[PDB]
Design a protein around this ligand. Structure first.
Ligand code: HEM
Ligand SMILES: CC[C@H]1OC(=O)[C@H](C)C(=O)[C@@H](C)[C@@H](O[C@@H]2O[C@H](C)C[C@H](N(C)C)[C@H]2O)[C@@H](C)C[C@@H](C)C(=O)/C=C/[C@H]1C
Length: 395
């Protein structure tokens, strides 16, 4: 079959990619596409095959296994655990695994609660009882939490929304590359500013680790670590909060059920992940050798994107897939991935989303979507499922 041009859609395809993916899945697990940006990649669709490929060591994450060239700015940031295989992956993840356990993350709850409380305070001061939920809460919450953990100073934080807007939806490819070079330059200076300062934030601890033994964490890896810990959880958590609140406000029966029984909160957040999680397609995977998927052979070195969004709409795995049901059995969803790269941030993301969702329901009487669903606009990006704005209102 010819390469499917996703740009030529659709539209449209950004607003509702699901029928496109489903049509592909009916034909088989693996498809050549051209993304709206213009890149020729493979999509893997269908829950069982997506789950298998996420964890299959035949599919590498190390760019040395890719035939796609990297720009200088891109290459400077790729020595990180998500863009590594064992043994490098194993070594890098061990340096920070203890910081992100459920137990350690649970210690942040009072502070996360305080941040949320103050953002909702500020939101509810609006004299017209209207806000954009992105601006008021979904954007500032995750950046505040992760900045405090890592040690990014408050005046430095606004620059990250500008850079992430550029990575997500860039005026042209060159502004994404400038954003990258700037962010890398900034992080290197931030890292340098910690040296000798006896800071106790995570970035300071990583700097001492690297300085004490460059074989345990090299200077490139120190920069890649600050980068991945900041970027991997940013656009994702922001959009979990926004997509999830959208799901709730556009399914009032479910909103009412959760209001009526707040013990349903954790399962509601799991169904937000399943139903409309922020990661539409996983990060790039590169076969180390050719891989046959049901008669379709993907060449060594090609780019493969696992379509988590389609996995989650596979009816054999999640019956009545297009129903948002906060009581659904969500076990096995792929929203945080699967296998050795499974999200290290999952406990922190869940903590943030659960506290945010609870705060909004509890403190916004008659909370409502303030435009019709058809008026919302989704960013076109093939990796991220995320809204431009989320107008809400309350009483
Ligand atoms: C709801 C929010 C989040 C979602 C949906 C999410 C999703 C994911 C997914 C799908 C992967 C695997 C990607 C792949 O295999 O190609 C991943 C990995 C990762 N995530 Fe998360 N993430 C979220 C929040 C966070 C946060 C808050 C942090 C950091 C504090 C974080 C840090 C990371 C890191 C460092 C990796 C790479 C792990 C590894 O390679 O071993 N994420 N995430
Ligand atoms: C949960 C994983 C997050 O993605 C990542 O952590 C990876 C490492 C990542 O940073 C890349 C996917 C970024 O994408 C690349 O960005 C460059 C500017 C250009 C490059 N090119 C091929 C288009 C592009 O793939 C990432 C900054 C993309 C944005 C949307 C993002 O924030 C993703 C976050 C998670 C999906």
């Amino acid at each position: 079959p010819p390469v499917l041009d996703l740009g030529a859609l659709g539209q449209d395809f950004a607003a509702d990619p699901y029928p496109t993916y489903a049509r592909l899945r009916a034909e088989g697990p693996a498809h050549r596409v051209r993304t709206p940006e213009g890149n020729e990649v493979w999509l893997v669709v269908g829950y069982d095959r997506a789950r298998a490929v996420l964890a299959d060591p035949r599919f590498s994450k190390d760019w040395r296994n890719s035939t796609t060239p990297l720009t200088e700015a891109e290459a400077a940031l790729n020595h990180n655990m998500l863009e590594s295989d064992p043994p490098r992956h194993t070594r890098l993840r061990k340096l920070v695994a203890r910081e992100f356990t459920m137990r350690r993350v649970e210690l942040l709850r009072p502070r996360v609660q305080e941040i949320v409380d103050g953002l909702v305070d500020a939101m509810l001061a609006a004299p017209d009882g209207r806000a954009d939920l992105m601006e008021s809460l979904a954007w500032p919450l995750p950046i505040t939490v992760i900045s405090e953990l890592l040690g990014v100073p408050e005046p430095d934080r606004a620059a990250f929304r500008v850079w992430t807007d550029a990575f997500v939806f860039p005026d042209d490819p060159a502004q994404a590359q400038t954003a990258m070079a700037e962010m890398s330059g900034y992080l290197s200076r931030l890292i340098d500013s910690k040296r000798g300062q006896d800071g106790e934030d995570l970035l300071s601890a990583l700097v001492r680790t690297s300085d004490e033994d460059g074989s345990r964490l090299t200077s490139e890896e120190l920069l890649g670590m600050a980068h991945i810990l900041l970027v991997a959880g940013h656009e994702t958590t922001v959009n979990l909060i926004a997509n999830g609140m959208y799901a709730l406000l556009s399914h009032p029966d479910q909103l009412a059920a959760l209001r009526a029984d707040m013990t349903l909160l954790d399962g509601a957040v799991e169904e937000m992940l399943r139903y409309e999680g922020p990661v539409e397609s996983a990060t790039y995977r590169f076969p180390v050798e050719p891989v046959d998927l049901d008669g379709t052979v993907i060449p060594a070195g090609d780019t493969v994107l696992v379509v988590l969004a389609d996995a989650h709409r596979t009816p054999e795995r999640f019956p009545d897939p297009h129903r948002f049901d906060i009581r659904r059995d969500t076990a096995g969803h792929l929203a945080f991935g699967h296998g050795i790269h499974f999200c290290i941030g999952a406990p922190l993301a869940r903590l943030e989303a659960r506290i945010a969702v609870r705060a909004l329901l509890e403190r916004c009487p008659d909370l409502a979507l303030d435009v019709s669903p058809g008026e919302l606009v989704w960013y076109p990006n093939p990796m991220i499922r995320g809204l431009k704005a989320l107008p809400i209102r309350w009483r």
